[PDB]
């Protein structure tokens, strides 16, 4: 969808950056109502392009309560990704602010985005880059997935991406097989997602801290896993360890992890 620049007010301020270049807050002018917008404008100082227009075609496909939706893409200065805004901004930054933020509360968040990567999985997308700063907040009650950068759309005969090239990865929400063969599926998100739960726990902090990328493959060969965070329940650091199975055939899909998530969820929602 081809953007009118005209209709589009940026303001100067920056939300965040990436290798892409930078978020920036803006306006857009729709069909009647104006919808404040989140924008994604390239550095551009053309493989960044092709990158922000594949991520464009990506999201174009998608449409979930759970997933940030696309306004559209626009030509000008740069060339500009227009998604409808999460004004709270990345989960792990939010939590990081918020330590006072519920276990009934991560819950609820965390159930979410399984939601929305059940829904993905079922389009037969694989997300390569799901952690806490891809988890953006509409609200405290509401979280939707984003950055659709490293995301493939799986060929009608497979259910696995092979990477050609390797890097820059975020090894340390990688699993094994993505390390070792380069074979990204909708299981290897199941062991980002349980990474990303553990950040969740953990109120954002950085998972495997103080380790190379080289010393987090040589823990999980050996069988080792991140510890329970502190006050996180053990039904929920229970679900981390199955979304860490080091056999991916024996690994969870999201359908068994939401499933999981949603009966805890409603547990929660009882003894409350
Ligand atoms: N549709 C959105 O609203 C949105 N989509 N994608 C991203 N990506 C970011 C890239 C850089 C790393 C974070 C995140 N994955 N950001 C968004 N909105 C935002 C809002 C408030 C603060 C910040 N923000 N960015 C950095 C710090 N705060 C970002």
């Given at each position: 969808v081809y953007l009118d620049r005209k209709l589009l007010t940026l303001e100067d301020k920056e939300l965040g950056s990436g290798n892409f270049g930078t978020v920036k807050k803006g306006y857009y002018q729709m069909k009647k109502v104006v919808k404040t917008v989140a924008v994604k404008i390239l550095k551009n100082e053309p493989a960044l392009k092709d990158e922000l227009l594949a991520e464009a075609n990506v999201m174009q496909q998608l449409d979930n309560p759970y997933i940030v939706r696309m306004i559209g893409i626009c030509e000008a200065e740069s060339w500009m990704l227009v998604m409808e805004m999460?004004?709270?901004?990345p989960l792990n930054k939010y939590l990081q602010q918020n330590r006072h933020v519920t276990d009934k509360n991560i819950i609820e968040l965390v159930h979410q985005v399984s939601m929305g990567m059940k829904y993905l999985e079922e389009s037969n997308?694989?997300?390569?880059?799901?952690a806490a700063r891809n988890v953006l907040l509409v609200t405290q009650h509401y979280a939707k997935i984003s950055d659709?950068?490293?995301s493939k759309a799986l060929r009608?005969?497979?259910n696995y991406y092979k990477a050609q090239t390797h890097g820059?990865?975020?090894?340390?929400?990688?699993a094994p097989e993505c390390i070792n063969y380069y074979k990204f599926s909708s299981k290897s998100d199941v062991w980002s997602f349980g990474v990303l739960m553990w950040e969740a726990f953990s109120y954002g902090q950085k998972p495997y801290?103080?380790?190379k990328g080289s010393e987090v493959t040589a823990m999980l060969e050996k069988g080792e896993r991140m510890g329970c965070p502190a006050g996180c329940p053990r039904e929920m650091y229970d679900l981390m360890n199955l979304c860490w199975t080091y056999d991916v055939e024996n690994r969870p899909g999201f359908a068994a992890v939401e499933l999981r998530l949603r009966n805890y969820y409603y547990d929660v929602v009882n003894h409350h």
């Open positions: 999460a004004e709270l901004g997308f694989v997300h390569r880059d799901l659709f950068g490293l009608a005969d497979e820059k990865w975020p090894v340390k929400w990688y801290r103080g380790m």
